[PDB]
Amino acid sequence: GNKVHIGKVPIMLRSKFCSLRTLDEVDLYKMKECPYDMGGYFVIN
Amino acid sequence: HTKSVYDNGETLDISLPIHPKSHIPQGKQDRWVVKLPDFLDINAEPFDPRPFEMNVKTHEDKNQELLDKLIAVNTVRWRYAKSETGGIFKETNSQIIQWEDGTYSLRVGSEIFDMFTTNTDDNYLVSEHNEEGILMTESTLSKSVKLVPASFQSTTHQKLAKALSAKQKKESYARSVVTKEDPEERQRRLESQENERYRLERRRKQAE
Amino acid sequence: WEEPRLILDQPAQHDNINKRYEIRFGKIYLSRPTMTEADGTTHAM
Amino acid sequence: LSNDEVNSIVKMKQSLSSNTGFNTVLKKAQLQEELEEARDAHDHERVARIEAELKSIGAES
Numbered sequence: 001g002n003k004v005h006i007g008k009v010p011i012m013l014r015s016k017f018c019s020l021r022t023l024d025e026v027d028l029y030k031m032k033e034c035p036y037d038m039g040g041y042f043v044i045n
Numbered sequence: 046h047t048k049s050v051y052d053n054g055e056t057l058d059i060s061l062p063i064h065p066k067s068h069i070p071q072g073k074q075d076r077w078v079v080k081l082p083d084f085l086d087i088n089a090e091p092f093d094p095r096p097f098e099m100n101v102k103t104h105e106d107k108n109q110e111l112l113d114k115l116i117a118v119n120t121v122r123w124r125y126a127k128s129e130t131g132g133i134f135k136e137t138n139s140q141i142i143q144w145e146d147g148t149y150s151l152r153v154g155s156e157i158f159d160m161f162t163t164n165t166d167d168n169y170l171v172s173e174h175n176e177e178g179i180l181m182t183e184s185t186l187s188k189s190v191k192l193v194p195a196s197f198q199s200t201t202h203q204k205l206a207k208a209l210s211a212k213q214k215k216e217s218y219a220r221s222v223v224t225k226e227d228p229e230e231r232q233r234r235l236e237s238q239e240n241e242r243y244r245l246e247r248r249r250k251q252a253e
Numbered sequence: 254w255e256e257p258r259l260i261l262d263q264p265a266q267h268d269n270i271n272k273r274y275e276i277r278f279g280k281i282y283l284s285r286p287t288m289t290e291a292d293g294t295t296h297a298m
Numbered sequence: 299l300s301n302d303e304v305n306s307i308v309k310m311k312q313s314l315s316s317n318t319g320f321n322t323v324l325k326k327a328q329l330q331e332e333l334e335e336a337r338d339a340h341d342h343e344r345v346a347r348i349e350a351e352l353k354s355i356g357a358e359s
Binding site for chain 2: 280281282283284285287289293295
Binding site for chain 2: 331334
């Protein structure tokens, strides 16, 4: 009995579990993300 | 006229052992029931400085440690005081103060907690005699008393506020982890093994 | 943790052997979003 | 080329890879994820090393 995988939860952008919460201003451009984007939405398909 | 149900007259010759009292109330058998707050504690045991110093506990949780420190410093205690004449006397760190308005306050050290009294009727105190299964009354609980901190600036109130404010700040249950492989790999490999042993078992059963 | 226990019991007589099979749910572990390609490699997304 | 051969060549060039902005950003993100994992495990020794590595890698312009 250990970490069994039960599913995948979609992540809201710019939230605490998003990859863009870090990365500062400069790296946000290298990832082709607009710094004016505010997050708050999911990406499904 | 509700006639008395019991008329058999049967009587029990039970004799109860009673012990002399160290003190006797004067003028009125009245007592005040007081609810014990969380920030105030009673230590009926005589104060033993060495076990107390040797049993102080240190915890990582700052809120719990602060609460324990506050309750320990505010705990009502007592100890034996050697009189200058060579005798032994009971010495306590707690006193009751009555102000000019007639209100009462419980004092531990420099801390003062006000008392709020509400009159209660048909409330009495009894002594339990379990070995005989009967209850012997003791006195009447006329007033219910609540203990309240005197003011905001009191150190007890500030410590309680700090503890309760920082207690609800810490809230993080899910623990992060890093995935190195496909989370579905275990299921598919175990399904493959299960199907393999299904085929082997079916062959064995057909050959059995 | 709302329903932290799944319980199965069995009074085996087939010698009364009451066996209870119970499984409990523990911690939740979350991770950063990850992409698993068809070939098998997984990488941050 | 096959998929496995492509992965092998990519790993070989990554070993040869001195620096690349996209790859540096990916490495920094992976380091941040590892750091939060260490933080949630209350490992005060690993987190110091990860913080030092992040400080060394960072300071962009």
